[PDB]
Symmetry: C4
Amino acid sequence: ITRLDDHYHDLLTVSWPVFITLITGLYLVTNALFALAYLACGDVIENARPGSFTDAFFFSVQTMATIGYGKLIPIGPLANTLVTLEALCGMLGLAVAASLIYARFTRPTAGVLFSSRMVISDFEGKPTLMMRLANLRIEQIIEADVHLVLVRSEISQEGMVFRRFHDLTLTRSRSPIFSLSWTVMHPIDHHSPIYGETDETLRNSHSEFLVLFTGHHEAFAQNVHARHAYSCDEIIWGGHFVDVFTTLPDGRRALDLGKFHEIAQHHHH
Amino acid sequence: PRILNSDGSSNITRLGLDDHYHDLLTVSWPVFITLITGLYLVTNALFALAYLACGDVIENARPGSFTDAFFFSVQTMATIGYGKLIPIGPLANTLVTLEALCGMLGLAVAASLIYARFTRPTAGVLFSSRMVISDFEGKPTLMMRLANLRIEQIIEADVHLVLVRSEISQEGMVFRRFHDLTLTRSRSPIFSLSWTVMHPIDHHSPIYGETDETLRNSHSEFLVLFTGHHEAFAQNVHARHAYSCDEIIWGGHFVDVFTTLPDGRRALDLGKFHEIAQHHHH
Amino acid sequence: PRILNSDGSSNITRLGLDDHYHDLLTVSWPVFITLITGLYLVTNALFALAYLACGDVIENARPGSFTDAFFFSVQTMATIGYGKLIPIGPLANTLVTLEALCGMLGLAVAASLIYARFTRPTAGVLFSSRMVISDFEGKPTLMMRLANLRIEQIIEADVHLVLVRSEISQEGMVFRRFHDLTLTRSRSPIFSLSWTVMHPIDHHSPIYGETDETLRNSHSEFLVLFTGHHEAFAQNVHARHAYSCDEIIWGGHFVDVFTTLPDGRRALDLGKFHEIAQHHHH
Amino acid sequence: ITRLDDHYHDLLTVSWPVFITLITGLYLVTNALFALAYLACGDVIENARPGSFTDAFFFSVQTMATIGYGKLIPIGPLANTLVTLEALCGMLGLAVAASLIYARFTRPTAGVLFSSRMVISDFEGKPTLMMRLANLRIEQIIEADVHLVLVRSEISQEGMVFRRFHDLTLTRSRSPIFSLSWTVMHPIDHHSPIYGETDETLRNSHSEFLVLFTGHHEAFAQNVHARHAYSCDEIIWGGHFVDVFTTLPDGRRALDLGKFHEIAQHHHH
Ligand SMILES: [Ca+2]
Ligand SMILES: [Cl-]
Ligand SMILES: [Cl-]
Ligand SMILES: [Cl-]
Ligand SMILES: [Cl-]
Ligand SMILES: [Cl-]
Ligand SMILES: [Cl-]
Ligand SMILES: [K+]
Ligand SMILES: [K+]
């Protein structure tokens, strides 16, 4: 929604193919511009068909890349001035292009799967709100933290209606090494802000649930971040996640992420 | 009279080559580029002269010409090496060698600076020009607000609100001490619009019982640090601001920050962002 | 039988272009270089061929020669541009253009990978091959030790020791649960030699009352994460290790790790580092 | 002391002048080597005095830097092979040199002054162990943490004598913005491990005190780290630091770091 262009860094987020196309285009265009500049000055390039855009272009190219074959060369003090300018550009351009590439290499995704739903069901004798996460890569994430946050609408003494945030208590919230799957659980005890709440009351308060995940990925040697929001619709009351850890034919332990979004539910005549 | 300036920096006076580094880091792009270009012309000027102190060691060059020895240099340092101009003396060939190293060094350094500048984005966080004290949940509460000036979100954001005032110890020493103020909420999971940060003034507050007058006499200021992970830049940002006593409106309340556009949509009117309601007495 | 391998990685089987990236990051220097060289020869091979599909668009080149069109390419892509060999067709001149872009891209990428590899040093931390349980301050205490393998120090170091075992819930579900074990000390300000990490088995311990036998039956493993700031590299490092029940010596004690050299000096004998004393009964 | 070479990264720590000298030397030597290689093959460089080291060197130089004037050129398939090799080296060499420079730029010092001494003296009615720190740069350090840690020798029930670490409680240990001077204080209360200790007892236990400092420097946009150790000798019992904050002629507030290591002490006939 509205608040009251060069700084467009789509450059960092777009796909590689697209990124290479933009770099490539910006590189053709900049040579197009220099070629024109040279033509503006006349025939200041030796050995170039007069007035020819082609030869002026490839001349630019060999100047900017610094290939400098030496068949085409500049003659004006005008040409040598542009050459000097074009040399700086090729240098800054490389320097920038490498900047953008190195960066793009270091804003990696978390590779983290969130279950499509939450459940509320008994664990250790209390109703418990749960969801789960999976590491989609072989590399491990170390010092993983997760937060499960309720956002709902509440009323102050002064009568003002506002969105309140509650960081829900988790049986475990820091995993020091996260490699496979992690079931995140919030025991709904007397202290829980959802204690006594039902699907209907959660609807009324416009309740939502955010999960936020952080950790240091060994795959990138840099911290990663992932989050997901759940609406009330997406809580299965009485659901239990299906085990994703299973034993193989041999007796090898296996993780089967195909079961990951599956939830068992009791059905009554 | 101000110990911290609004932007959080110190107002005190400090008694007690490497400057142009942290300098290429902080100036604007136009200036950064200009300086770089400058350092590049100058460097070439120098070598050109170094070739002219050698006499005529550039074949195909007009003798004593700066122009020609300067375009030689450029062509050498950039490594374009067309071939018309070319070194003759072992003297010229040694300069070429050195000049080649400088351009290679020059590139690396310039690439460093460019990348570094790319990795220090501003937080783009707005601070309300004032704080207010007024009731929240039946308690007087010190508040200030923050807004995100970009469309991308800052996540895992937190804020610290700190009192700084002068106090007198039992030993009769006067000194400034920091108090971290407990907030009703000091974290924002997704900071995308506006955020009213709040310090209930309860029994535990260091400003419990305090008035405009008593804050003034202790030289009380309020310092705020904000930090978070900017998704726009995939990196951490931080922002700071400070307020003096003057900038607390006792009794005021921040105004609804939203507007209605002709079609019926809702927009954040950051024009209202610093607006404060007060009761006016008959 | 092992859920975690010694090096802390998972032993489970997983069901459910971009590989050669995280790959140039992890291989050894020799191999990294070889691959890079390879990708560089190959790339040049390709362009050379692309020039030969054009016929003879390289002046001064022996017709149909790969050798010559290959050294053309090299000279173009590296931007050496001597001038003997040179493009003739607009076809040749377009390839040159493209080839120039690749070398520039190729450099940037190769510089990225090199820098990235420079910024992922190993922690150089050694883990003792076993844990022991024995008395510290009159309490049975689970211990393991760590050593720094480099002369530079790791500062602001901390360690986490975690139990993983199988448990049965009230609802009769079996599941593996992590317990973070409280340590007598989980931080080391300057980690420079050796460090015995310790978990007193007190009333609060999840292994209070546990025996070799009961740990075995719950499939108990112990997982350790270490982290710190390596001064050698001015960056953060981390290290992990895991132990099974087998690797607890009940009753053992780590042995003094130091030695005496002929002159009388003292040296850390990392040869003793994994040694464990036990009482042997008559 | 002893434990039981290429990986020598002095490259990162040495002074710039020294660093540039090593880069420069490594660059001369590598060209020296290529020049020899070319000579090994005979006269495979056109336009080079036969057997001449000079011409073979500058040829190498123009190849490795990729200046390629084109007077000197290769002729063998041998020369063109070395050229191909030398091109790769210049590329890797630049790539490495830029790596080392960028890194060196990002391992900045904290610029933090530690007082040369500690004091123990009354603050708010308790004896208090103190020392102080100063930011030596105009830029601020944000989220500064300090730790004050006692290391002394102690005896276990089992009789074993070992170094114990105590992280001392500070009146303030996190400063959210650190710009000038910070007096770090540990109240010696009933809970302090130095409660009841004297200079003599601290000597006996071989007590030392570490200060460790961390924060994010705005000057570098990267975290910095500094530490200092104090022996017993360096505690002035009864000392009070001299105020470094002062008023100027005008009434401007000033910080005078010249007073920074000064401690007031009472003297008795
Ligand atoms: Ca070149
Ligand atoms: Cl709130
Ligand atoms: Cl902005
Ligand atoms: Cl909070
Ligand atoms: Cl190592
Ligand atoms: Cl600890
Ligand atoms: Cl200990
Ligand atoms: K040439
Ligand atoms: K050239």
